[PDB]
Amino acid sequence: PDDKEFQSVEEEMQSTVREHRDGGHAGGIFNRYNILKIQKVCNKKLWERYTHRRKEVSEENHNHANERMLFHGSPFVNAIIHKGFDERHAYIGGMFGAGIYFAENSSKSNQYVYGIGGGTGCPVHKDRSCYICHRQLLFCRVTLGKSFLQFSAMKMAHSPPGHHSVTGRPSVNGLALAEYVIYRGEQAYPEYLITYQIMRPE
Ligand SMILES: Nc1cccc2c1CC=NC2=O
Ligand SMILES: [Zn+2]
């Protein structure tokens, strides 16, 4: 029961890895991970904040929440599991402005685990491609509702009028991979905490 639910999470984590345009600069060089632990996050207060907002979005989107399971990489995963996602920590600088960003490709979210563009990498070795240090990603329940499809940079403070999120679609002069942006922290729930390492290619 728990093992099968977690095997599904491991499969999503492994199967969504892609080769990155930066040649591994931000997230490191790897084709797969060593998945160490998968924990289900049970935070009743966050779950109800999430389901309350999901119902509200569904009602504003033809009885459809447009919920997706997506990855989130951040140095602040421990604060997110306890306090939830918080749009007050998002700033206008991002490609789609002051939102909370998610990926359908685990390796894209892996580029953010140690900071923007991988920061200086792991705290112990200052290596963005560290194979030793254990990383953590979140696999989240995200309510997209009526998602505004965009290709080019659009610095938003909030969702576009009548919408509940932004979907960043791949394009020639733009994104290599998709990304999903919400502008309200209650529109995501950090369901699984994945502890892993990137693995050195064979
Ligand atoms: N910019 C972007 C795009 C897609 C996923 C993420 C991010 C930022 C932080 N964390 C992420 O997981
Ligand atoms: Zn390290």
PDB file of C-alpha atoms and ligand atoms in Angstrom:
ATOM      1  CA  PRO A   1       0.000   0.000   0.000  1.00  0.00           C
ATOM      2  CA  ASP A   2       2.588   2.624   1.187  1.00  0.00           C
ATOM      3  CA  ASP A   3       5.353   0.998  -0.943  1.00  0.00           C
ATOM      4  CA  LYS A   4       3.210   1.119  -4.187  1.00  0.00           C
ATOM      5  CA  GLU A   5       2.189   4.775  -3.588  1.00  0.00           C
ATOM      6  CA  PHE A   6       5.898   5.582  -3.035  1.00  0.00           C
ATOM      7  CA  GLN A   7       7.041   3.475  -6.089  1.00  0.00           C
ATOM      8  CA  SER A   8       4.737   5.726  -8.185  1.00  0.00           C
ATOM      9  CA  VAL A   9       6.476   8.835  -6.723  1.00  0.00           C
ATOM     10  CA  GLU A  10       9.940   7.283  -7.376  1.00  0.00           C
ATOM     11  CA  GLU A  11       8.880   6.510 -10.999  1.00  0.00           C
ATOM     12  CA  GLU A  12       7.695  10.139 -11.546  1.00  0.00           C
ATOM     13  CA  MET A  13      10.928  11.448 -10.043  1.00  0.00           C
ATOM     14  CA  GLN A  14      13.104   9.163 -12.295  1.00  0.00           C
ATOM     15  CA  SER A  15      11.108   9.218 -15.579  1.00  0.00           C
ATOM     16  CA  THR A  16      10.826  13.060 -15.750  1.00  0.00           C
ATOM     17  CA  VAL A  17      14.614  13.727 -15.731  1.00  0.00           C
ATOM     18  CA  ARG A  18      15.728  15.662 -18.841  1.00  0.00           C
ATOM     19  CA  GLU A  19      19.087  16.825 -20.238  1.00  0.00           C
ATOM     20  CA  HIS A  20      19.437  20.515 -19.325  1.00  0.00           C
ATOM     21  CA  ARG A  21      20.550  23.309 -21.736  1.00  0.00           C
ATOM     22  CA  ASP A  22      23.071  24.615 -19.088  1.00  0.00           C
ATOM     23  CA  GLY A  23      24.995  21.273 -19.336  1.00  0.00           C
ATOM     24  CA  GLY A  24      24.350  20.613 -15.637  1.00  0.00           C
ATOM     25  CA  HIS A  25      25.672  23.995 -14.367  1.00  0.00           C
ATOM     26  CA  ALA A  26      22.750  24.665 -11.963  1.00  0.00           C
ATOM     27  CA  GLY A  27      21.665  21.163 -10.896  1.00  0.00           C
ATOM     28  CA  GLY A  28      24.662  18.923 -11.597  1.00  0.00           C
ATOM     29  CA  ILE A  29      25.439  16.157 -14.104  1.00  0.00           C
ATOM     30  CA  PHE A  30      23.258  13.038 -13.835  1.00  0.00           C
ATOM     31  CA  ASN A  31      20.738  10.859 -15.714  1.00  0.00           C
ATOM     32  CA  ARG A  32      19.074   9.376 -12.597  1.00  0.00           C
ATOM     33  CA  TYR A  33      18.835   9.692  -8.814  1.00  0.00           C
ATOM     34  CA  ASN A  34      19.502   7.527  -5.802  1.00  0.00           C
ATOM     35  CA  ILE A  35      16.105   7.899  -3.979  1.00  0.00           C
ATOM     36  CA  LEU A  36      16.804   7.553  -0.254  1.00  0.00           C
ATOM     37  CA  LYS A  37      13.463   8.257   1.427  1.00  0.00           C
ATOM     38  CA  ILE A  38       9.943   9.323   0.441  1.00  0.00           C
ATOM     39  CA  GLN A  39       7.789  10.677   3.258  1.00  0.00           C
ATOM     40  CA  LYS A  40       4.147  11.633   3.004  1.00  0.00           C
ATOM     41  CA  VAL A  41       3.520  15.024   4.649  1.00  0.00           C
ATOM     42  CA  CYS A  42       0.446  15.024   6.917  1.00  0.00           C
ATOM     43  CA  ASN A  43      -0.198  18.593   7.959  1.00  0.00           C
ATOM     44  CA  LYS A  44      -3.955  18.893   8.700  1.00  0.00           C
ATOM     45  CA  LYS A  45      -4.000  22.727   8.858  1.00  0.00           C
ATOM     46  CA  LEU A  46      -2.195  23.028   5.461  1.00  0.00           C
ATOM     47  CA  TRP A  47      -4.366  20.317   3.905  1.00  0.00           C
ATOM     48  CA  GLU A  48      -7.551  22.171   4.841  1.00  0.00           C
ATOM     49  CA  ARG A  49      -6.198  25.529   3.659  1.00  0.00           C
ATOM     50  CA  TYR A  50      -5.421  23.734   0.370  1.00  0.00           C
ATOM     51  CA  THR A  51      -8.780  21.898  -0.008  1.00  0.00           C
ATOM     52  CA  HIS A  52     -10.757  25.033   0.924  1.00  0.00           C
ATOM     53  CA  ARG A  53      -9.020  27.006  -1.852  1.00  0.00           C
ATOM     54  CA  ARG A  54      -9.272  24.006  -4.275  1.00  0.00           C
ATOM     55  CA  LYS A  55     -13.087  23.949  -3.846  1.00  0.00           C
ATOM     56  CA  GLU A  56     -13.258  27.765  -4.444  1.00  0.00           C
ATOM     57  CA  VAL A  57     -11.093  27.481  -7.632  1.00  0.00           C
ATOM     58  CA  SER A  58     -13.184  24.459  -8.851  1.00  0.00           C
ATOM     59  CA  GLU A  59     -16.364  26.548  -8.495  1.00  0.00           C
ATOM     60  CA  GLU A  60     -14.754  29.372 -10.537  1.00  0.00           C
ATOM     61  CA  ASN A  61     -13.496  26.847 -13.190  1.00  0.00           C
ATOM     62  CA  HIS A  62     -16.532  24.854 -14.436  1.00  0.00           C
ATOM     63  CA  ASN A  63     -16.425  22.439 -11.354  1.00  0.00           C
ATOM     64  CA  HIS A  64     -12.803  21.559 -12.204  1.00  0.00           C
ATOM     65  CA  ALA A  65      -9.835  22.282  -9.958  1.00  0.00           C
ATOM     66  CA  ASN A  66      -7.258  21.393 -12.728  1.00  0.00           C
ATOM     67  CA  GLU A  67      -5.060  19.780 -10.031  1.00  0.00           C
ATOM     68  CA  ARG A  68      -1.632  18.392 -10.981  1.00  0.00           C
ATOM     69  CA  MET A  69       1.174  16.637  -9.106  1.00  0.00           C
ATOM     70  CA  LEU A  70       4.287  18.788  -9.669  1.00  0.00           C
ATOM     71  CA  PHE A  71       7.822  19.163  -8.279  1.00  0.00           C
ATOM     72  CA  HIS A  72       9.163  22.071  -6.231  1.00  0.00           C
ATOM     73  CA  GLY A  73      12.852  22.637  -5.448  1.00  0.00           C
ATOM     74  CA  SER A  74      13.895  25.008  -2.690  1.00  0.00           C
ATOM     75  CA  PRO A  75      16.444  25.474   0.111  1.00  0.00           C
ATOM     76  CA  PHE A  76      13.396  26.101   2.392  1.00  0.00           C
ATOM     77  CA  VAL A  77      11.559  22.754   2.141  1.00  0.00           C
ATOM     78  CA  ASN A  78      11.441  22.366   5.982  1.00  0.00           C
ATOM     79  CA  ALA A  79       9.713  25.761   6.400  1.00  0.00           C
ATOM     80  CA  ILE A  80       7.280  24.815   3.536  1.00  0.00           C
ATOM     81  CA  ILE A  81       6.267  21.499   5.173  1.00  0.00           C
ATOM     82  CA  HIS A  82       5.538  23.263   8.475  1.00  0.00           C
ATOM     83  CA  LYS A  83       4.140  26.655   7.331  1.00  0.00           C
ATOM     84  CA  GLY A  84       3.096  25.952   3.732  1.00  0.00           C
ATOM     85  CA  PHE A  85       3.863  27.810   0.510  1.00  0.00           C
ATOM     86  CA  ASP A  86       3.929  31.560   0.974  1.00  0.00           C
ATOM     87  CA  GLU A  87       3.573  34.053  -1.896  1.00  0.00           C
ATOM     88  CA  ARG A  88       4.973  36.784   0.444  1.00  0.00           C
ATOM     89  CA  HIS A  89       8.412  35.094  -0.173  1.00  0.00           C
ATOM     90  CA  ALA A  90       8.034  35.463  -3.967  1.00  0.00           C
ATOM     91  CA  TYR A  91       9.401  38.587  -5.774  1.00  0.00           C
ATOM     92  CA  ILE A  92       8.703  40.220  -9.175  1.00  0.00           C
ATOM     93  CA  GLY A  93      12.079  39.170 -10.685  1.00  0.00           C
ATOM     94  CA  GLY A  94      11.062  35.655 -11.879  1.00  0.00           C
ATOM     95  CA  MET A  95      10.151  34.909 -15.560  1.00  0.00           C
ATOM     96  CA  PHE A  96       6.420  35.077 -14.676  1.00  0.00           C
ATOM     97  CA  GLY A  97       6.842  37.506 -11.786  1.00  0.00           C
ATOM     98  CA  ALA A  98       6.065  37.108  -8.076  1.00  0.00           C
ATOM     99  CA  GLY A  99       4.804  33.554  -8.065  1.00  0.00           C
ATOM    100  CA  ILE A 100       5.558  30.109  -6.652  1.00  0.00           C
ATOM    101  CA  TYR A 101       7.097  27.939  -9.380  1.00  0.00           C
ATOM    102  CA  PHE A 102       6.638  24.236 -10.069  1.00  0.00           C
ATOM    103  CA  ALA A 103       7.916  21.833 -12.712  1.00  0.00           C
ATOM    104  CA  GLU A 104       6.597  18.627 -14.278  1.00  0.00           C
ATOM    105  CA  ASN A 105      10.316  17.574 -14.710  1.00  0.00           C
ATOM    106  CA  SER A 106      12.050  16.634 -11.425  1.00  0.00           C
ATOM    107  CA  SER A 107      15.479  17.664 -12.862  1.00  0.00           C
ATOM    108  CA  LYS A 108      14.194  21.220 -13.495  1.00  0.00           C
ATOM    109  CA  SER A 109      13.156  21.550  -9.801  1.00  0.00           C
ATOM    110  CA  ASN A 110      16.522  19.950  -8.807  1.00  0.00           C
ATOM    111  CA  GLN A 111      18.216  23.141 -10.286  1.00  0.00           C
ATOM    112  CA  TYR A 112      16.641  25.148  -7.397  1.00  0.00           C
ATOM    113  CA  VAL A 113      17.356  22.926  -4.384  1.00  0.00           C
ATOM    114  CA  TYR A 114      20.493  24.896  -3.425  1.00  0.00           C
ATOM    115  CA  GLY A 115      19.187  28.297  -4.594  1.00  0.00           C
ATOM    116  CA  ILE A 116      18.573  30.254  -7.825  1.00  0.00           C
ATOM    117  CA  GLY A 117      20.700  28.646 -10.550  1.00  0.00           C
ATOM    118  CA  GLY A 118      21.845  26.141  -7.895  1.00  0.00           C
ATOM    119  CA  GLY A 119      23.419  28.885  -5.723  1.00  0.00           C
ATOM    120  CA  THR A 120      26.896  27.805  -4.527  1.00  0.00           C
ATOM    121  CA  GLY A 121      25.730  24.189  -4.290  1.00  0.00           C
ATOM    122  CA  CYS A 122      25.762  21.971  -1.199  1.00  0.00           C
ATOM    123  CA  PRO A 123      26.687  23.686   2.161  1.00  0.00           C
ATOM    124  CA  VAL A 124      29.491  21.122   2.891  1.00  0.00           C
ATOM    125  CA  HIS A 125      31.410  20.999  -0.443  1.00  0.00           C
ATOM    126  CA  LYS A 126      30.083  24.121  -2.295  1.00  0.00           C
ATOM    127  CA  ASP A 127      29.411  21.785  -5.261  1.00  0.00           C
ATOM    128  CA  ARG A 128      26.259  22.206  -7.431  1.00  0.00           C
ATOM    129  CA  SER A 129      27.000  18.683  -8.792  1.00  0.00           C
ATOM    130  CA  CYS A 130      27.586  17.088  -5.368  1.00  0.00           C
ATOM    131  CA  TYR A 131      26.999  13.302  -5.455  1.00  0.00           C
ATOM    132  CA  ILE A 132      27.565  12.949  -1.705  1.00  0.00           C
ATOM    133  CA  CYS A 133      25.156  15.384  -0.027  1.00  0.00           C
ATOM    134  CA  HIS A 134      21.517  14.432   0.330  1.00  0.00           C
ATOM    135  CA  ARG A 135      19.016  16.713  -1.443  1.00  0.00           C
ATOM    136  CA  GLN A 136      15.326  17.196  -0.811  1.00  0.00           C
ATOM    137  CA  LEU A 137      12.536  17.994  -3.338  1.00  0.00           C
ATOM    138  CA  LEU A 138       8.821  18.282  -2.784  1.00  0.00           C
ATOM    139  CA  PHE A 139       6.245  16.486  -4.960  1.00  0.00           C
ATOM    140  CA  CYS A 140       3.165  18.685  -4.608  1.00  0.00           C
ATOM    141  CA  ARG A 141      -0.526  18.771  -5.178  1.00  0.00           C
ATOM    142  CA  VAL A 142      -1.041  22.018  -7.169  1.00  0.00           C
ATOM    143  CA  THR A 143      -4.393  23.631  -8.054  1.00  0.00           C
ATOM    144  CA  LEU A 144      -3.987  25.343 -11.445  1.00  0.00           C
ATOM    145  CA  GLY A 145      -7.664  26.189 -12.072  1.00  0.00           C
ATOM    146  CA  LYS A 146      -8.044  28.328 -15.213  1.00  0.00           C
ATOM    147  CA  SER A 147      -4.371  28.472 -16.243  1.00  0.00           C
ATOM    148  CA  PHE A 148      -3.137  31.329 -18.395  1.00  0.00           C
ATOM    149  CA  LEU A 149      -0.914  29.880 -21.175  1.00  0.00           C
ATOM    150  CA  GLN A 150       2.170  32.048 -21.791  1.00  0.00           C
ATOM    151  CA  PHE A 151       5.401  31.592 -23.843  1.00  0.00           C
ATOM    152  CA  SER A 152       7.408  34.767 -23.176  1.00  0.00           C
ATOM    153  CA  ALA A 153       8.386  36.560 -19.912  1.00  0.00           C
ATOM    154  CA  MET A 154       5.353  38.246 -18.288  1.00  0.00           C
ATOM    155  CA  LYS A 155       6.181  39.774 -14.886  1.00  0.00           C
ATOM    156  CA  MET A 156       2.913  39.319 -12.937  1.00  0.00           C
ATOM    157  CA  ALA A 157       2.230  40.302  -9.310  1.00  0.00           C
ATOM    158  CA  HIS A 158      -0.945  38.112  -9.337  1.00  0.00           C
ATOM    159  CA  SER A 159      -2.750  35.671 -11.622  1.00  0.00           C
ATOM    160  CA  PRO A 160      -4.031  37.328 -14.834  1.00  0.00           C
ATOM    161  CA  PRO A 161      -7.697  38.538 -14.561  1.00  0.00           C
ATOM    162  CA  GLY A 162     -10.143  35.589 -14.522  1.00  0.00           C
ATOM    163  CA  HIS A 163      -7.307  33.033 -14.067  1.00  0.00           C
ATOM    164  CA  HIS A 164      -5.869  31.013 -11.101  1.00  0.00           C
ATOM    165  CA  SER A 165      -2.341  30.289 -12.427  1.00  0.00           C
ATOM    166  CA  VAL A 166       0.158  30.712 -15.295  1.00  0.00           C
ATOM    167  CA  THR A 167       1.487  27.832 -17.422  1.00  0.00           C
ATOM    168  CA  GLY A 168       4.862  28.593 -19.023  1.00  0.00           C
ATOM    169  CA  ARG A 169       4.904  26.635 -22.333  1.00  0.00           C
ATOM    170  CA  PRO A 170       8.215  25.657 -24.158  1.00  0.00           C
ATOM    171  CA  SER A 171       9.236  27.875 -27.158  1.00  0.00           C
ATOM    172  CA  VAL A 172      12.219  28.315 -29.596  1.00  0.00           C
ATOM    173  CA  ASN A 173      13.515  31.582 -28.041  1.00  0.00           C
ATOM    174  CA  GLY A 174      12.102  30.774 -24.589  1.00  0.00           C
ATOM    175  CA  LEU A 175      11.644  27.877 -22.183  1.00  0.00           C
ATOM    176  CA  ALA A 176      13.139  24.446 -22.843  1.00  0.00           C
ATOM    177  CA  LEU A 177      10.580  22.839 -20.463  1.00  0.00           C
ATOM    178  CA  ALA A 178       7.178  23.735 -18.964  1.00  0.00           C
ATOM    179  CA  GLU A 179       6.680  25.498 -15.629  1.00  0.00           C
ATOM    180  CA  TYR A 180       3.554  26.235 -13.554  1.00  0.00           C
ATOM    181  CA  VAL A 181       3.143  29.345 -11.461  1.00  0.00           C
ATOM    182  CA  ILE A 182       0.676  30.138  -8.694  1.00  0.00           C
ATOM    183  CA  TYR A 183       0.361  33.513  -6.929  1.00  0.00           C
ATOM    184  CA  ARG A 184      -1.426  32.270  -3.750  1.00  0.00           C
ATOM    185  CA  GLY A 185       0.434  29.930  -1.390  1.00  0.00           C
ATOM    186  CA  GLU A 186      -2.787  28.029  -0.431  1.00  0.00           C
ATOM    187  CA  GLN A 187      -3.027  26.703  -4.072  1.00  0.00           C
ATOM    188  CA  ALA A 188      -0.370  24.058  -3.351  1.00  0.00           C
ATOM    189  CA  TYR A 189       0.120  21.292  -0.781  1.00  0.00           C
ATOM    190  CA  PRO A 190       3.613  19.754  -0.179  1.00  0.00           C
ATOM    191  CA  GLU A 191       2.426  16.123  -0.265  1.00  0.00           C
ATOM    192  CA  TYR A 192       5.719  14.210  -0.523  1.00  0.00           C
ATOM    193  CA  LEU A 193       9.175  15.003   0.744  1.00  0.00           C
ATOM    194  CA  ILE A 194      11.781  13.162  -1.347  1.00  0.00           C
ATOM    195  CA  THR A 195      15.310  12.737   0.035  1.00  0.00           C
ATOM    196  CA  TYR A 196      17.729  11.795  -2.735  1.00  0.00           C
ATOM    197  CA  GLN A 197      21.138  12.157  -4.342  1.00  0.00           C
ATOM    198  CA  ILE A 198      21.900  12.848  -8.001  1.00  0.00           C
ATOM    199  CA  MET A 199      23.989   9.926  -9.352  1.00  0.00           C
ATOM    200  CA  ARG A 200      27.232  10.141 -11.274  1.00  0.00           C
ATOM    201  CA  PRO A 201      26.556   8.977 -14.913  1.00  0.00           C
ATOM    202  CA  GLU A 202      27.787   5.440 -15.778  1.00  0.00           C
TER     203      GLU A 202
HETATM  204  N1  LIG B   1      11.780  29.010 -11.809  1.00  0.00           N
HETATM  205  C1  LIG B   1      11.311  27.693 -11.572  1.00  0.00           C
HETATM  206  C2  LIG B   1      10.698  26.945 -12.628  1.00  0.00           C
HETATM  207  C3  LIG B   1      10.167  25.591 -12.356  1.00  0.00           C
HETATM  208  C4  LIG B   1      10.374  24.977 -11.088  1.00  0.00           C
HETATM  209  C5  LIG B   1      10.972  25.745 -10.050  1.00  0.00           C
HETATM  210  C6  LIG B   1      11.436  27.093 -10.255  1.00  0.00           C
HETATM  211  C7  LIG B   1      11.946  27.847  -9.100  1.00  0.00           C
HETATM  212  C8  LIG B   1      12.031  27.268  -7.863  1.00  0.00           C
HETATM  213  N2  LIG B   1      11.654  25.920  -7.685  1.00  0.00           N
HETATM  214  C9  LIG B   1      11.146  25.113  -8.713  1.00  0.00           C
HETATM  215  O1  LIG B   1      10.852  23.961  -8.414  1.00  0.00           O
HETATM  216 ZN    ZN B   2      28.268  18.104  -0.823  1.00  0.00          ZN
END
